[PDB]
Symmetry: D2
Subunit: 386 residues, 4 copies
Amino acid sequence: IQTTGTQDRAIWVKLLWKISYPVIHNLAEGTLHQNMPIETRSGETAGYKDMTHLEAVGRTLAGVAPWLALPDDDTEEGKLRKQMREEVLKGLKNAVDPASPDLLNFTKHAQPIVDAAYLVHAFLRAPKALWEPLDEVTKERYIKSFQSLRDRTGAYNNWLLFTGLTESFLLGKGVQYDQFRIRVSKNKVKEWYVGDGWYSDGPSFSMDNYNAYVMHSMMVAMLENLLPKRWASQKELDEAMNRMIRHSEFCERMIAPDGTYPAFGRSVTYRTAAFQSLADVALRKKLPSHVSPAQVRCALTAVHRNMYEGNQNFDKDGWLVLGFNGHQPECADGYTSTGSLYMATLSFLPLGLPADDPFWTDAYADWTSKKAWKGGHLHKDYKVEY
Amino acid sequence: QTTGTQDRAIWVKLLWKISYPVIHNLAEGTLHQNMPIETRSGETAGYKDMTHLEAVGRTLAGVAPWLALPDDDTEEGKLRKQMREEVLKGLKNAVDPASPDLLNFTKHAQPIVDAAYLVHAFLRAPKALWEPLDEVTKERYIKSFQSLRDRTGAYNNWLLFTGLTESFLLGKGVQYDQFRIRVSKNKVKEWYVGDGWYSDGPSFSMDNYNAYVMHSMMVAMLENLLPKRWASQKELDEAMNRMIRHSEFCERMIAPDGTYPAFGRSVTYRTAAFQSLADVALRKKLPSHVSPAQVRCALTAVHRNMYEGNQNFDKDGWLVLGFNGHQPECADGYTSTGSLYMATLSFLPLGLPADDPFWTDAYADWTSKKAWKGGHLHKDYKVEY
Amino acid sequence: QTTGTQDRAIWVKLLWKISYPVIHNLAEGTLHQNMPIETRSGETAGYKDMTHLEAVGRTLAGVAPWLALPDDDTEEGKLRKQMREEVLKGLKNAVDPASPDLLNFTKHAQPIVDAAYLVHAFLRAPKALWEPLDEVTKERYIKSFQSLRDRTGAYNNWLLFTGLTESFLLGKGVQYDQFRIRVSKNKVKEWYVGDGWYSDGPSFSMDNYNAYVMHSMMVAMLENLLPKRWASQKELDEAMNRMIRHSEFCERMIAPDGTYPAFGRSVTYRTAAFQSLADVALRKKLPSHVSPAQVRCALTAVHRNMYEGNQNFDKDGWLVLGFNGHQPECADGYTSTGSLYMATLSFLPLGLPADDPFWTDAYADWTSKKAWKGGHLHKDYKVEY
Amino acid sequence: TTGTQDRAIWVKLLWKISYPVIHNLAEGTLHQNMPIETRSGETAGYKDMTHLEAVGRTLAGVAPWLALPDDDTEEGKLRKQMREEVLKGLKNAVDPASPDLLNFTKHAQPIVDAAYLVHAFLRAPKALWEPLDEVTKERYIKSFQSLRDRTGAYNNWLLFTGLTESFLLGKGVQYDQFRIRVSKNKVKEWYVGDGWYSDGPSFSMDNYNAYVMHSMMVAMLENLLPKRWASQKELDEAMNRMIRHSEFCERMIAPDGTYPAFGRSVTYRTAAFQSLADVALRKKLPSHVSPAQVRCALTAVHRNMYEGNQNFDKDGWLVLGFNGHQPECADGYTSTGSLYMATLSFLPLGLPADDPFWTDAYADWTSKKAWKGGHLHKDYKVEY
């Protein structure tokens, strides 16, 4: 029994709302610090307290932004989009308001480097919906907030993209940016490419979801910012773009016939963020020839329902819990807390395609593994050299 | 749920279902007369020169551990006894100049690959499959392996094929190629990219060839090199630990429904995707948070999902081109019927005896099966070695 | 042949000849007024914004060790105190916003390079050249160094300039850029290719830039990071031994006639090609088969062949574009008069006191001078660290 | 001086080096008469390998000169005399009855010097290979094929077996495809930049880029090209890397005609200039480096090293050292036969006497110009 693309879209909307609205509405009401849980594996909240809310806000907005970039209309979904966008804009104003209880932390610890970069990515996926409407004083505060990060740093790995993307955003805004951060993060990430659509997360190859969590989406987004200033070439952007496209094939292929996907590597608590590269490629209308938009929609539909339709991944008040499919704090990394979990929005990027795009209107289609395992047509795969 | 005893009888049944047509036909000298030469295009020229050694080498590499067990009086023991005798008969025929089943070693580059799988069979069961051969046949295999040195293939995992063969000749006390051993070992080490993965040649390739070739053969080669001082104990341990780490990903990619993703080239090798998991389990080197029982139960579900029904077999019981079903469109141009017998390579845990904890411990869910129903989920993390 | 004492007086004369015009004009506020701005193209636009910091930073980085010596009233002691007082005066001028010799830190990427050489002077003579500065002047240099963070240059040895500058700021207890230190340290370590050589950026460059920048500044940077646990003692030892190794080649390339090859880019930097040799010598870390006296004597010959005559000097005592002579055809487009004061960087041994054995041991032929006469030639061999 | 006088100096010095090896081999008295000097004084082990070292290393350097057509000049008479003695010694060297039968089967070392012998055959095929009788030809093919049971270091040694197999490929006999494929790919991977390879996994600042890597990579690739074991771009790449490398070697000749002693195997002496001599012979010098200044720089080197007797023993054999008797700088693997690398800087004698390399007016080399205030071409590392 299949669903239609229009039914699938409605499901995604319900599920994305279920994930993100607690974060967005509390931020808008100024009650995010007050109400969000701070669940950690250890149970300690010290330290986590200073960073988890920027984690929730940046990671949530990074995933809902394409949806909120769509032009307004009077349809039912269009009303939901308008409402969430208004609450987001209200929370974004609070988040840098010194009188707001939800003033977010940018000045302390290395962690905000990460989450500022996901916030920046939201601004890049929806400039006209989420950045341009901000009043000038709010805009200037975000500029200074991003510039204040430069006295700290994180690991020698995918973290280079966080500070690289942030500076590339500042460059795109015509404000003062750090050329060193832009240059070394680009070249380093290029040196870390190991083949067949995969980078190493730092000097050693890591078989995990971090290529989807950080590397492809942000390498591409950063290079796009750098092209007009000639800080990167079209060749470099096409290169990173095609490596993301290739990576998305493996990620669509690892969705099983039952709609599950393997749990592997660190930060498994990010759940369907493991599909951000497939979600980004779908949003950009760049799926490879043999991988239909419908089959990606349907594959990610099954995964979305498998992980967010029931309440196994949510607490009594609708917040995400530590775990994978269930309350499983034993798989949370020591650096993870409740706000970290909002990477979960990053598979919902194709809601930034309009409701009349083929991704949402083509008929249901089995995905690769589902075809493979019932004897259907199974396209030949092969590693690439670019 | 089935018991571990029942699981073993299923693996026996399905490993027999796969391997017996190759083994019995070679035993009877009718493998050339009887084995299909299915290709995606349908052409059989060229393929016909190489496909029968593919079937034999790949089949034997996978059944060799089972056939290595000590004999006993059980019903399974009789099956082992019967199969081993037919293998020994086929191996004599395979290098007999007057047998219609004489195998090709001199034409094409492809024999380099499948001689290495046969060598791997000899290495997994030396007392059972090599030593009982008569000396004339042993000498013929020695010369057959040495005659491979005029050709070569791709600059990738293929280097392990010739390194492993040469490490076998070394281990046998006959003349071997030191250059093949020195460069193959060093290049494979240079291709390690991290977290249990090698690049299949200069460029990383997200596929099953780390399982098909690289881990098992690098470990097995270093095992031959070590007593002869062509590798150090630390080099062996390093390759061993890298294979063990790799088997973690492979156990984790078995889904709750017993399936696993179809990705990368040579997907027609089916469950050979699990040779590194199977090699680690046979070696009883599974990390402490991955129970022997969950590996048994995971691979049982995969084995039944791929081999219990007949979707992957033709009317005569031979493997067909595909993944789960008749899917010729996913077969590489280099693949034929004989190539498909990689399918044996997930059955190495039959090389543990019936009373090993792998086969007696109670049923256990595997990693994703637990993860997806809210059960306990061990935290994973990339390693640095 | 000369004695050590006559060699020291020669080096003092020649270092003074090179450096005094820069230092004395800076002290007098007349550096911008009097220093030529000679370029291959003949253009001064752009170059005039940067060429004076180049002059100052490069001159100071090379005279710093000598000025670090304790004071005494010998004829040389008088010269050291005269020059030090004029450096201290010029350094105040260089950041005084009303001084005519105010230096540029904010325009172009080039200040990143020459601020680093000025930092290196401060690192080589902290009690002589940094501590005596007034607090306003100190804070100005701190702010100047931090204002560089909006620019960058080439993806090569330049990473050490910003890495070393930030390591100085860290050592001064002020706000420093951690990202700059982390990636510069790791990238430069990644560019080590072997036998005492780094690649200048991603592709190996057979030129003098290992001496111009990489060894001396890697070591000095790790020295600053060590007490703050931003580098290990193992990392510093590695860099130190790599520089020691590198100096062996540089001492071996001085010919029996006291010349050395002209090769690679920025050949106009003249004896700065021997900075790693000079640095290892000053640190009293020459390998056992290379005596201090043979380094003194080889570098004395080079120093006299390059600086005693006036072939490399214009009518006013400034350095000219060239190698040994007026040779603007070999000057890079990025080079001007100020750039040439890299020539000080081989006089680091003057930072060893006048009774150090480098300056008192009997004359000794250097490696190639012995080799080409039939004398003892120590066996060389590439190293694995 | 004139290039014609220089050329006569090179002929005389090349003969001074090589004629002891060649003449004794043609007489069958090489084993009897050649010393086996070592730093330790031991001769065991060395005695099994050092003679092929002298023959292979000598012939690799004299081969271009002996490829020249015969003519009635005085120099022509010397070439035909030397060539005929080489052909005689070559027959002897694989004659199972000859006292100068060379070892190919014992130790790893013959892998090296068979490659140098192969390089002599590649450098002068019509003069030193074709005239050999068929049975002697057969014996060499077998001797080269018998090397496949042994190997040496994981470094420049790969080129020895690669070049040898490419020779067998070129002769249409049975060859090792694996040796050709891996040696080609490994050496490409060891290229670090600016005309230098690492000698194995770790970069080594020494003369082995000139000793082995450039000339043998290029020669091997030329054999592979027509058989589709290498492409034209691959050959062009290795050629341009050799050409770039010769610039540094030409620049390290000092104004006094010396050059720095550095790195291992320094006892090979002017073989440090094989890549320069090879590019000169190939007439591929970069446009700012005149053939004449190369001729003249190497004449100063060749005289500083070979005109006097500081590098020879009482019987005209090379002795261990650099410039003088300096056995303290010889590696433990080096013996008397090893020293005949010294021929490898003489390749441009393979240009005829009327080539511009030998008739262009005297010119100062790069450092001689630079140090007297002459013109100095701007150098810059390359990216290919």
